[PDB]
Design an enzyme around this catalytic site. Structure first.
Site, PDB file in Angstrom:
ATOM      1  N   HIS A   1       0.785  -1.133  -0.095  1.00  0.00           N
ATOM      2  CA  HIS A   1      -0.044  -0.091   0.021  1.00  0.00           C
ATOM      3  C   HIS A   1       0.820   1.263  -0.066  1.00  0.00           C
ATOM      4  CE1 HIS A   1      -2.590  -2.906   1.772  1.00  0.00           C
ATOM      5  NE2 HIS A   1      -3.287  -2.656   0.687  1.00  0.00           N
TER       6      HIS A   1
ATOM      7  N   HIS B   1       4.868   7.252   6.428  1.00  0.00           N
ATOM      8  CA  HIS B   1       4.559   6.560   5.106  1.00  0.00           C
ATOM      9  C   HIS B   1       4.307   7.694   4.244  1.00  0.00           C
ATOM     10  CE1 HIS B   1       0.379   6.852   6.679  1.00  0.00           C
ATOM     11  NE2 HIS B   1       0.344   7.139   5.489  1.00  0.00           N
TER      12      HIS B   1
ATOM     13  N   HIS C   1       2.615   9.021  -0.083  1.00  0.00           N
ATOM     14  CA  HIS C   1       1.308   8.844  -0.991  1.00  0.00           C
ATOM     15  C   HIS C   1       2.039   9.326  -2.128  1.00  0.00           C
ATOM     16  CE1 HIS C   1      -1.343   7.007   1.814  1.00  0.00           C
ATOM     17  NE2 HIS C   1      -0.982   7.999   2.824  1.00  0.00           N
TER      18      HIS C   1
ATOM     19  N   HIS D   1       2.806  11.335   5.255  1.00  0.00           N
ATOM     20  CA  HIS D   1       2.078  11.352   6.956  1.00  0.00           C
ATOM     21  C   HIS D   1       2.780  10.608   7.977  1.00  0.00           C
ATOM     22  CE1 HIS D   1      -1.694  11.088   3.882  1.00  0.00           C
ATOM     23  NE2 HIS D   1      -1.239  12.422   4.060  1.00  0.00           N
TER      24      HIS D   1
ATOM     25  N   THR E   1      -7.277   7.670   5.682  1.00  0.00           N
ATOM     26  CA  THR E   1      -7.384   7.468   4.339  1.00  0.00           C
ATOM     27  C   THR E   1      -7.418   6.168   3.606  1.00  0.00           C
ATOM     28  OG1 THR E   1      -5.152   7.860   3.747  1.00  0.00           O
ATOM     29  CG2 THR E   1      -6.629   9.810   3.929  1.00  0.00           C
ATOM     30  N   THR E   2      -6.976   5.012   4.611  1.00  0.00           N
ATOM     31  CA  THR E   2      -7.162   3.819   4.219  1.00  0.00           C
ATOM     32  C   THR E   2      -8.099   2.934   5.249  1.00  0.00           C
ATOM     33  OG1 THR E   2      -5.072   2.888   5.216  1.00  0.00           O
ATOM     34  CG2 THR E   2      -4.598   3.649   3.329  1.00  0.00           C
TER      35      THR E   2
HETATM   36  N1  LIG Z   1      -3.036   7.731   5.433  1.00  0.00           N
HETATM   37  S1  LIG Z   1      -3.420   7.739   6.929  1.00  0.00           S
HETATM   38  O1  LIG Z   1      -4.709   8.050   7.208  1.00  0.00           O
HETATM   39  O2  LIG Z   1      -2.513   8.703   7.609  1.00  0.00           O
HETATM   40  C1  LIG Z   1      -3.104   6.495   7.668  1.00  0.00           C
HETATM   41  C2  LIG Z   1      -2.543   5.264   7.083  1.00  0.00           C
HETATM   42  C3  LIG Z   1      -2.273   4.157   7.971  1.00  0.00           C
HETATM   43  C4  LIG Z   1      -1.832   2.910   7.171  1.00  0.00           C
HETATM   44  O3  LIG Z   1      -0.588   2.607   7.387  1.00  0.00           O
HETATM   45  N2  LIG Z   1      -2.101   2.094   5.895  1.00  0.00           N
HETATM   46  C5  LIG Z   1      -1.905   2.727   4.773  1.00  0.00           C
HETATM   47  C6  LIG Z   1      -0.412   2.631   4.217  1.00  0.00           C
HETATM   48  C7  LIG Z   1       0.452   2.537   5.206  1.00  0.00           C
HETATM   49  O4  LIG Z   1       1.965   2.450   4.867  1.00  0.00           O
HETATM   50  C8  LIG Z   1      -2.561   3.944   9.240  1.00  0.00           C
HETATM   51  S2  LIG Z   1      -1.984   2.435   9.875  1.00  0.00           S
HETATM   52  C9  LIG Z   1      -2.689   2.442  11.410  1.00  0.00           C
HETATM   53  C10 LIG Z   1      -2.046   3.116  12.475  1.00  0.00           C
HETATM   54  C11 LIG Z   1      -2.732   3.050  13.609  1.00  0.00           C
HETATM   55  C12 LIG Z   1      -4.027   2.595  13.775  1.00  0.00           C
HETATM   56  C13 LIG Z   1      -4.684   2.151  12.832  1.00  0.00           C
HETATM   57  C14 LIG Z   1      -3.989   2.045  11.399  1.00  0.00           C
HETATM   58  C15 LIG Z   1      -2.934   5.136   9.936  1.00  0.00           C
HETATM   59  C16 LIG Z   1      -3.401   6.440   9.265  1.00  0.00           C
HETATM   60 CL1  LIG Z   1      -3.731   7.802  10.095  1.00  0.00          CL
HETATM   61 ZN   LIG Z   2      -1.266   8.116   4.902  1.00  0.00          ZN
END
Ligand SMILES: NS(=O)(=O)c1cc(C(=O)NCCCO)c(Sc2ccccc2)cc1Cl
Ligand SMILES: [Zn+2]
Ligand SMILES: NS(=O)(=O)c1cc(C(=O)NCCCO)c(Sc2ccccc2)cc1Cl
Ligand SMILES: [Zn+2]
Lengths: 251, 251
Positions: free
Chosen positions: B60, B86, B88, B111, B192-193
């Site tokens: 992702h 991470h 985008h 982010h 956003t995921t």
């Molecule tokens: N885009 S974002 O809103 O900033 C976002 C992305 C991801 C995520 O990692 N997945 C997408 C690609 C990652 O490398 C997570 S992960 C996570 C952490 C704590 C709690 C739950 C989930 C949290 C957020 Cl806020």
């Molecule tokens: Zn993100």
């Protein structure tokens, strides 16, 4: 715990010694105008007369417990459910609001306590940011009997004794608050009673609610508190802002 | 789940169909200035070279796991700990920022995800207001090689493979972020995921950080994800504000 003596509240709950406590002195000159602050939204506050609500002298205040389905929003995505309301007051010729404005203390204050819809219970929300929200309005002397307040004040005689309660018909709970939901101060603080947990969003209305002199005397003169003491002067001293900025919904 | 394929995000998590989602189009002219929004405070972000940090291609994004002791405050008594960061990004001739400004999509976006210190666990924070906070910055094409981003862009070769991971030396996380910590936008939205949980505080820096066109080609052209696909255009479509007002920390 009690007002006007021991134990020190910090011994009861360390959070009572937090840096970010309520209530505060509002100095509207130091208030930050924030146009993101929109008029408050209240749904379901107009209750039918049955089922009845419980009104209780808990020795610290008079509390009306609210039924499920009273929804309040501070703004889009900022949603709350109303739990209860209670009052803070003084004594013959002594004001007892919790909040002050430029050091002015008002005769009395209403607090309507709400729980964020992300939390099932208050104990889960305590100390979490925005977990609890309080709507606060000053009560002042006006010339007319307030008929919404009369429904509660007419019942104080029945609950004079500390720990006493009675049932009252459902009413328009929103008629206990000012009709202007546009003009308010908003800041982050605490419970004003133990355990004094922080994370509470405080909204203090610009507009005041009017009670008769006789209504204010009924509030301050009827209820008995811990031991053989009158339930009076049931307010916490003003707490320093300590660098917090009070926001205002108006310039 | 995956970007721009199937399954249907709302089937994976129905919170992805909620009313208060991220990302959004930022319209600076319509942002509400609040002087209560003070400069971001980020302590402990200048990490030593040891211990090393985990960098993972998760199909992702590329995710850098952050150690304990990265403390961040959005305001008095509103403190966070950094968990991970991470990115985008887009593809050849195609930008891939999540947030847009006046409809403009920037090349990429970083982010930095944080947990409120009022929650012990991320699973208690998810879906709770202010439980999670993200710092977000736009990446733009500048004429110079960015030093900070070089430390990560130069390790994407070793993790081109979906699910691959390497270790990298400690780096100054704060050097990944723009110059002026006093100039940002803020609103409440979602992941956003999936699971698209609401209650996330989004802080988007006014100023961008600059990468070389080389560095940007690298970010969008080195990693592989969903099966046999290049990991590209890993951004979510624009979500409506639904009455949310974006705040600005400057007039
Ligand atoms: N885009 S974002 O809103 O900033 C976002 C992305 C991801 C995520 O990692 N997945 C997408 C690609 C990652 O490398 C997570 S992960 C996570 C952490 C704590 C709690 C739950 C989930 C949290 C957020 Cl806020
Ligand atoms: Zn993100
Ligand atoms: N004044 S306040 O900040 O708005 C406040 C008061 C009370 C409260 O009812 N305190 C006891 C006296 C009033 O009935 C509660 S909830 C509660 C807490 C401890 C003990 C019992 C109930 C929540 C709040 Cl936010
Ligand atoms: Zn109260």
């Amino acid at each position: 715990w009690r007002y006007g003596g021991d134990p020190p509240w910090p011994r009861v709950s360390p959070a009572c010694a937090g840096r970010f406590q309520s209530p505060v002195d509002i100095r509207p000159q130091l208030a930050a105008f924030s146009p993101a602050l929109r008029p408050l939204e209240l749904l379901g506050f107009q209750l039918p007369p049955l089922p009845e609500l419980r009104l209780r002298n808990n020795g610290h205040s008079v509390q009306l417990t609210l039924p499920p389905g009273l929804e309040m929003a501070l703004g889009p995505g900022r949603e709350y459910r109303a739990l209860q309301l209670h009052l803070h007051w003084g004594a013959a010729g002594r004001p007892g609001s919790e909040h002050t404005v430029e050091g002015h203390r008002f005769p009395a204050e209403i607090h309507v306590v709400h729980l964020s819809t992300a939390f099932a219970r208050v104990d889960e929300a305590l100390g979490r940011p925005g977990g609890l929200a309080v709507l606060a309005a000053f009560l002042e002397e006006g010339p007319e009997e307030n008929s919404a307040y009369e429904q509660l004040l007419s019942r104080l005689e029945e609950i004079a004794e500390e720990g006493s309660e009675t049932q009252v018909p459902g009413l328009d709970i929103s008629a206990l608050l000012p009709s202007d939901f546009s003009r308010y101060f908003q800041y982050e603080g605490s419970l004003t009673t133990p355990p004094c947990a922080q994370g509470v969003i405080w909204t203090v209305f610009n507009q005041t609610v009017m009670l008769s002199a006789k209504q204010l005397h009924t509030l301050s003169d009827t209820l008995w508190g811990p031991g053989d003491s009158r339930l009076q002067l049931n307010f916490r001293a003003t707490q320093p802002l300590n660098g917090r900025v009070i926001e205002a919904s108006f310039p």
